[PDB]
Amino acid sequence: VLLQRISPLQIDPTIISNTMSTLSPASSILGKLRPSNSDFS
Amino acid sequence: EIQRHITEFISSWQNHPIVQVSADVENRKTAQLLHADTPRLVTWDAGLCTSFKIVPIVPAQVPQDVLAYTFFTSSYAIQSPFPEAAVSRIVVHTRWASNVDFDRDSSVIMAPPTENNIHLFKQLLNTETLSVRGANPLMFRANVLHMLLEFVLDNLYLNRHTGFSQDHTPFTEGANLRSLPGPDAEKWYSIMYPTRMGTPNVSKICNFVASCVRNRVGRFDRAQMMNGAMSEWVDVFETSDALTVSIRGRWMARLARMNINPTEIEWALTECAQGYVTVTSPYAPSVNRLMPYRISNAERQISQIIRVMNIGNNATVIQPVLQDISVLLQRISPLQIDPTIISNTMSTVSESTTQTLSPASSILGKLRPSNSDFSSFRVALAGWLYNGVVTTVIDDSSYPKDGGSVTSLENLWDFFILALALPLTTDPCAPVKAFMTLANMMVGFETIPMDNQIYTQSRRASAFSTPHTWPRCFMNIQLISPIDAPILRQWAEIIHRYWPNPSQIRYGTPNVFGSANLFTPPEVLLLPIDHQPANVTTPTLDFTNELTNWRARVCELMKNLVDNQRYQPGWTQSLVSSMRGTLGKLKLIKSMTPMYLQQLAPVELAVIAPMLPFPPFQVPYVRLDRDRVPTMVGVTRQSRDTITQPALSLSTTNTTVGVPLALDARAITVALLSGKYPPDLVTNVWYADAIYPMYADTEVFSNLQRDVITCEAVQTLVTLVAQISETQYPVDRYLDWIPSLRASAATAATFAEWVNTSMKTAFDLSDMLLEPLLSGDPRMTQLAIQYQQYNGRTFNVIPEMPGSVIADCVQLTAEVFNHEYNLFGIARGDIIIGRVQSTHLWSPLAPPPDLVFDRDTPGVHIFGRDCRISFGMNGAAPMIRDETGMMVPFEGNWIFPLALWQMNTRYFNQQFDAWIKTGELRIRIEMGAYPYMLHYYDPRQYANAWNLTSAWLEEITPTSIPSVPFMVPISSDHDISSAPAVQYIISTEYNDRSLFCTNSSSPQTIAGPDKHIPVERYNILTNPDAPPTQIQLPEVVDLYNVVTRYAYETPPITAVVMGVP
Amino acid sequence: DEADDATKKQAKDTEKAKAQVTYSDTGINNANELSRSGNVDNEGGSNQKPMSTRIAEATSAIVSKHPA
Amino acid sequence: AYIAVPAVVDSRSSEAIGLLESFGVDANDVSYQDHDYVVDQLQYMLDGYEAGDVIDALVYRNWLHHSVYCLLPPKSQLLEYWKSNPSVIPDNVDRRLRKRLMLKKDLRKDDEYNQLARAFKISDVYAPLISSTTSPMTMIQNLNQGEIVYTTTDRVIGARVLLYAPRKYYAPHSRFNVGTFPSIATPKCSVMSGVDIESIPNEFIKLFYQRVKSIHANILNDISPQIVSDMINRHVDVYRVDVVNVLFEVVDVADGLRSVSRKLIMHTVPVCILELLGIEIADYCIRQEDGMFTDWFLLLTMLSDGLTDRRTHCQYLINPSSMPPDVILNISITGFINRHTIDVMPDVYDFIKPIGAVLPKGSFKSTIMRVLDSISVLGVKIMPRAHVVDSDEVGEQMEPTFEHAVMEIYKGIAGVDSLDDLTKWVLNSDLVPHDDRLGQLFQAFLPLAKDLLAPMARQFYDNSMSEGRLLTFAHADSELLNANYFGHLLRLKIPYITEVNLMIRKNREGGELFQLVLSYLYKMYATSAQPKWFGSLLRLLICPWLHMEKLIGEADPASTSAEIGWHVPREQLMGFIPYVSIRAPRLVIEELMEKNWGQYHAQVIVTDQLVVGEPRRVSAKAVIKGNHLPVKLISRFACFTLTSKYEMRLTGRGAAYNARLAFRSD
Amino acid sequence: HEGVASSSIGKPFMGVPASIVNDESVVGVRAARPISGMQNMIQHLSKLYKRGFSYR
Amino acid sequence: QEYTQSPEIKVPIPQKDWTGPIGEIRILKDTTSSIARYLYRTWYLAAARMAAQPR
């Protein structure tokens, strides 16, 4: 918790979605990654 | 604490970033690729072109005891070009006194210096700036770059010739004066013609007007090439701005070399139509017109690369494109259904009703026509133009389930359908699949050796997509023995010898349009099948072509298979005879689609190709030769670590592009086996009538104008980024004195997003622009494409970067700002804080040299990286440690980095403010660049600056600092008394460039800072020897020069090139 | 406009509504052709504002007044 | 000259309205074209063709060259008509066919006649033939070439539609001409644009203008209404509202001088309200002595459909509080740029029902109710402090209130023992909700709102609907939906930030942080649907009445006044119960009279002690069993009232009577 | 609604003509976005489903 | 008794996970953390494969 609070880096997962732009190998990786959830403990 | 809580909540609500992530992605990319928004290039300005207006500050004292009121011209209501006031400044207001058709939605508007201007510097990255006042001094460079970008970007207009009238007064000498539209129009003549005002007085304005030169007013050159028509262009002497005139002249010069007259429009349209459609252009003198469409090849290639990156491994962006092209083919293609040939050639097959199996009834049920087959066929045919991004493979459902059997009639007919359908695909591995679809269905009955036991003889024929999964037994025919395998040997021979050969059609015209195709020579289009043009216009059936030869050879192959001695006895005699009749009657079908493909399809495809919204993008076609089979066509948009050369940073920093598209064999086979023409047609008349409406549009001409901007934007972006980051491109940097932070990879992205937002807002675009590049790191960007063959031989195409007038004008504006930072509102140098009590009237922006000091001044204690404060004890003076380890009291001359005061604002204030107010120390705070405010005080009363300087020092923050306040005395034109004045903040350099004139309508300026009207500006007027065109741009703006006004018309292409229906 | 009006006048001179001799939509492309319009003055400028109004504004731009 | 405007320009109605005074142009000299037929033709052809192609062809069409279409019958019929009336057969047709048509005893047995019959095709007989397959471009070009264009299919774009044969077989150039479709065919054709493509409502002119600007931006002669006026010079339809936008910038006036902070745009303020308020192009102060808004800025904000800024283009929200970060106190207005019309009558309204509106917790409900109460134009009250149900009023009348019920929710949640502890646990230091904790707390909040509130809410809503037609305010969409509300559902949002308004408000039965969390809970409880702006409802409620004041305010009161209500028969031993009231010109109500207010039955239960009142009047309860009153059945030229209570106009006991509507006047 | 967008432009479905309907999709700008007949079907069905059902 | 019950959704789709209205329909961005993304994907692919399929 302390490292997350004082860490300058913020983890947003929109980078993967923007890069890939969405089976198919393009969408299978996104489905397995599930970037949307916000939990990085 | 609740106030802090609500403040934090409101800040967290208002600090939302203005960024739009791509969510509705597929539809938006498909819509843009199928139709692109076109920027508004030509815009017309009817008002006088200028950006610097002169605003009064202190009201003029026209009532006074020393001089009567019958002296000033303001008492006689005499309109003057310059405001009559005690103090006059000049500020920046883009597009004031203008009448434009379309506003660029950008404006750099400056309030007078007596009002605050920090809101124009706290815009870009000041999200954490809490207070409404003040900005972070570490983004001043980015703010200034954005301000100059908007300046250049909204100053892009074309001047208009409006009208003239002979002067009816003895003011001028028979001059011509220009009139401009507007409701209140008579107020503009006195402003735009300074020399027209009379000089009865001995005021400063009258003195300057008298010193000016008489014979430079209004029009002096005309281009009247016609009677009763507008003059094409005129040259006028009017109040303007040299920088604005230069920018608009550069924009007009850029537009001029894109101009094309209707002659080559006629030529290009005729050469595109191949004489099917003829167009007519007039042959006569003309009103000059302006239709900018011609572009270079580099921009076309760059935009093609942008489109290729946009269409990346999606398989859904390109489907609507191919469907649209299929519709376009269906609209004009003479080939049609003939829905009865298949049934008519099967109803007459002689069979026996006793037999259970019937080849005709089997084929008629396996090959059902529904005329979606023609749509699929046209989609496959249109896929020929895009084999670098689309690989139109055949669908898996067409292949037999599990494995086929030669003993099965249904499987044999499925093999026939597949064999006919496969050659029309663009899949490089079509021949090996064609071989394996037969090799699979007859395993055990007939065997051939394989390479490995994974890709054995009984794998699915569709699973051979890789170029080097081709069996060695298929590469070398000698492996298949003629004794053990008498059928596969013949099938391999047929595949090797009678597979269709590639060709080309040579479409298009490069005189007007560019050469969008790459990896191929300009003006060519490759085809999977060979094309021989027809020499007659009355087509008739013939069997001497490749597709009919292929169909026949398949027919005799199956006939030999049926007639084989190890296969015939398993069948009865009547069924064998019926199947032989079926094959012989299906070989001689009267299908005309093969001849259509041979003769007329390439011609009409070449007709379609030019005015297509996604230009063809092709790679070489190779048949059965697995050494030049193209794999991994890749594109790049950035270097990686330190390689500044694209030729070396391309081979390992690319992204593969391409998708497979699936089509079914049952449709293509039906389309290839059924088709006629109208019963009596002639090709020339049919094509002319069909494609005349097609060439009326101007869509491709619109995409050319879009192509201009989509290449301007990237160069502008890289030029702007290179001045706040460290790039590989060579750029000329001027604003290194303005302080700025050390930008990270996200700061560049945010700056690029702001740049593209401003660009699209000004150029009126509603779709994506320059955004595909933004998904990567914008600090290092390069455009390059490549592809490599199977044997590793790679080829790369790197288009050269053409010049960009937008970035050129931005660099010019930055160069001008380097010398004229004061007008935009900026201070250069650093401030000095200390008591100065006197009765003198010198302006702080032009301080006497005695007060200032620098690092080289002896006895000055320079502080910096390290500083500690030790409290005094028992009356000992408190001491602060020097940067060189010394300990000094709170007295003397110091030098402070501004970062130190930002980091220790509260401590330093509480320790130093009392001593600054009453003691003796003077602190020089090195700032670099800062906005300023000006407060004018009455010289005859006691005035103190301590409140202002304290209310400036108490808001210095580790994030933001407010604008520096100054007190400037009011310049009186008559002798006055003297009262003490106390000042604390004084500049370092001469920082009073913004002043224009003090006590204009008055014989002289006695007390206070004086300045006559700047002679160096109105150089054309004051200097008789200077030629009218001569301008000294980098130093001054001259506020007056010659400007050329145009009257070119912009008609539609259709209204000048009719088309003679 | 003038060509269409001439075609209409020819059709009215004849009894048939259709015209057998027309000055408009003929095969020859003469886009360049210009006519004596009222939009331009004798100086080449536009008559967006009449010459009398333009001269009146130009001469009223600077006129003196009695002292207050 | 030809000028195109974004509207629907006819001859007579458009000449009467003008629409140049409506767009700001000061206009005989101008001749008005008609284009309703071509709008209908666009809608009809948009099926079998593509919108882009049709738009391109129609913009290549010019409108100063008069032409006309002419549908020929199909072939069998054409031959038939010619046979029946053979004087008409054109000369162009061949001698054999025409001579055999000019004969009797014709039938299907004839050999050579049939030979000519299916050897005949209409290629020579009618030369410019628009067949079924012709592209849109060719059809338009032809109209420009000639006066008459022959066609075989009805689906055409152009001038007109005429029938060549009888029906049974088928089976003004003035100086300046205005229109509603731009043409690029002429080198100089002027299109006027002071209004943006963002706000025009027809969606057909919207698509046309968008496409033409997208593909022909550089060659359009774009001008402005002022220059248009300069070039030109040298029953009353109600709910037709003219709107403009306000370009104003906020100024942080220090002790010294001016300092401009932000530039703002207010989208669709009506012109009439600006006229009555009499705002001028200058600066203003928007704050009371107490510290709240002056209620005219509040009325303007509630009357708009958007408030954005200029440097960026995202949705901007006013800060109600006086806190530092984005405080706003001074306003300077700097002109209006665009102006057009708008239909203030929403499509959702249809036939008359009670109206339900959904607003967030931290809205301005009390102030807007107070302002709407003191509104009167004619001898009527628009929306008093009655006919309105407050959002808290649905749950206020319970032994534990809903607020008190949700106060006792910390029980059953680990780590919390009090309401303040719960507020600390669910809200972080940022005062932004913690997603996990608030999502956990909603799992306890929802069962109470779905079991303890919903039945009582349904009963109360049904009771309120029974005894009159009232406007009901609610906090959440699901609150009205789950109670089976029988009325029009409207979702409304205000520009202001509601959370800070909750934070400044006090004594709302508990902690302020509790109010913030409860508001967040109601917000997330609501469904996912786009809320329209409050400006639509407020304009619908206010604006039409002002036009009535302008028109018939001078007229006689009794002559204009009229009303409708239930009519219980006289022979009911122990009457008029008004339903709606219409104020309109005499001609309008005379038109209203003969309309049959029949087949509208209701059961009326009217028993009570006198409602304390100015006149002796007992209260009634009416329930509608059949249909409801269509607004177009009433009028579009006559205003009326949205809400009204039920009370019988006159003692004894009460009973149920099946009554009908009636229309009484003077 | 967006499933059918990029596959059937125009070509009205059974008895339902194609039509025009705006959208405020991206940030502030709104287009006209021509829709097919099926999408007009979907718009009407969507208003029906959003409002609810009246049950005599 | 049958037409008055309503569903009880304990974790509804967040308001920020939608977009502007296409008429009366708002497209759901695929960046959502809700479980409805997979349902939307399945129905979207079904609709596309219908629309492309020619019968």
Topology:
The structure is cut from a larger assembly and holds 3 copies of chain A, 1 copy of chain D (666 residues) and 2 copies of chain E.
Chain A: H1 2-6, H2 14-20, H3 25-33
Chain D: E1 2-4, H1 12-17, H2 20-23, E2 30-32, H3 36-45, H4 51-60, E3 68-71, H5 75-84, H6 95-101, H7 111-119, E4 129-130, H8 136-145, E5 148-151, E6 176-179, E7 190-192, H9 204-215, E8 221-223, H10 225-233, E9 240-251, E10 260-270, H11 271-277, E11 283-285, H12 296-302, E12 307-309, E13 330-333, E14 339-343, E15 355-358, H13 365-373, E16 388-389, H14 402-407, H15 419-426, H16 435-466, E17 471-474, H17 477-481, E18 488-493, H18 498-504, H19 512-525, E19 532-533, H20 534-552, H21 557-560, E20 561-567, E21 576-583, H22 586-593, E22 601-605, E23 617-619, E24 621-624, H23 631-634, E25 639-640, E26 647-649, E27 656-665
Parallel strand pairs in D: 1-6, 1-7, 2-6, 3-5, 4-5, 7-8, 15-17, 15-18, 16-17, 18-19
Antiparallel strand pairs in D: 9-10, 9-13, 9-14, 10-12, 11-13, 20-21, 20-27, 21-25, 22-24, 22-27, 23-26
Helix pairs in contact in D: 4-8, 18-19
Chain E: E1 19-20, E2 34-35, H1 37-51
Antiparallel strand pairs in E: 1-2
Keywords (chain D): Capsid protein, Host cytoplasm, Host cytoskeleton, Virion
Protein name (chain D): Mu-2 protein
InterPro entries (chain D): Reovirus_Mu2
